[model samples]
Target: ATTLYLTRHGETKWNVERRMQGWQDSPLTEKGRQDAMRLGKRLEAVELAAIYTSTSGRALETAEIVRGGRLIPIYQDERLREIHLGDWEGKTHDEIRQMDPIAFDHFWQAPHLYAPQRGERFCDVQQRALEAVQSIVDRHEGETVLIVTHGVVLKTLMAAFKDTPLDHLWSPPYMYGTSVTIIEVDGGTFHVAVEGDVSHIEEVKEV
Candidate 1:
């Protein structure tokens, strides 16, 4: 069985603004960097065999921080990118809320049924995330791996792993920035050991 660690990228300026950063490449806030460094220290003992990140800047930056000079191989995969919100790319929460309250609420409430017009659907993300995992599990069994990805993408993948309804995407166990989740894959069997653990940055004072 291989242990897989999943982490959402650290905080971003848009994250502080409560905006949806779907597929938008944004820099991490100062706090975000601190969080990443903290996570690096916490994961140092895990001895990752490989690190995979989304093509987006935030995910890649998070991987780099967590690698912390370790020579672990890092790979970038576009299939792991956050859901692409076509028209909503750079919009703020307030602006989006006013423009489409019902649709927005449905998005946060009923994920399966809510599909943005001209934008990617929840199913699209789930499918890609599943494919990403299958690819990793097929090629990298018995080795520990780290995946730095977006919140929604991670959440969507977890839902699939739990074998719950697709709409459960908006349900409990909210994944936080810099949180770590572990999964195991062996002989095609998948199991989640931990999800959304933030002990790394809980009490550490940021520099």
Candidate 2:
């Protein structure tokens, strides 16, 4: 059996500001770094074989913090990056709602119908992320691996692995910064031990 831990990156400036961070980049807030360290402390008891992270700086930084002093191989992959929001990137939801109400509502309410001009669709994000996870599973049989990525990608992976409908993609509660999700795979079957777990970081009031 292979145990896989899927985690979202720590909070960023954009995250704190409630901005659309798709494809764009932002430095982590002070609370973000602390959350990363807290997550590392929580996972210290587990032995990780390797770490995989999105190419985005935020995800990479979170992954490094999770690794702590351990010398672990960390691989970066674009497929693990957040969904591209095109014109909406870097804009706050209030601004988007005022500027493009239809699109903004679609993005939050009906993700399946939310596809902005030049933006990648939720279906595309799900496909690429699912493929990347499959590749990781194939490469690491019986080994425990950690994946640090963005919110959309992590949600897409959870939905795909759990065989949930694409339309319900946004039904799950928003994943907290550095939230932990544990999955176990055996003979091609996937079992979820935890989903969007933040109990490890509950004591961190700053988070």
- Go through the candidates in order and give the C-alpha RMSD of each one to the true structure: 2.5, 1.8
> Each candidate's TM vs. the true structure?
0.94, 0.95
Whole-model lDDT per candidate: 0.84, 0.86
Candidate 2 residue pairs in backbone clash: none
Among the numbered candidates, top TM-score falls to 2
The deviation in Å at residue 69 for candidate 1 is 1.0
How far off is residue 93 in model 1, in Å? 1.4
Off by over 4 Å in 1: 203-207
RMSD of 1: 2.5
**Cα lDDT for residue 187, candidate 1:** 70
TM-score of 1: 0.94
- Which ten residues in a row are the worst by lDDT in model 1? 198-207
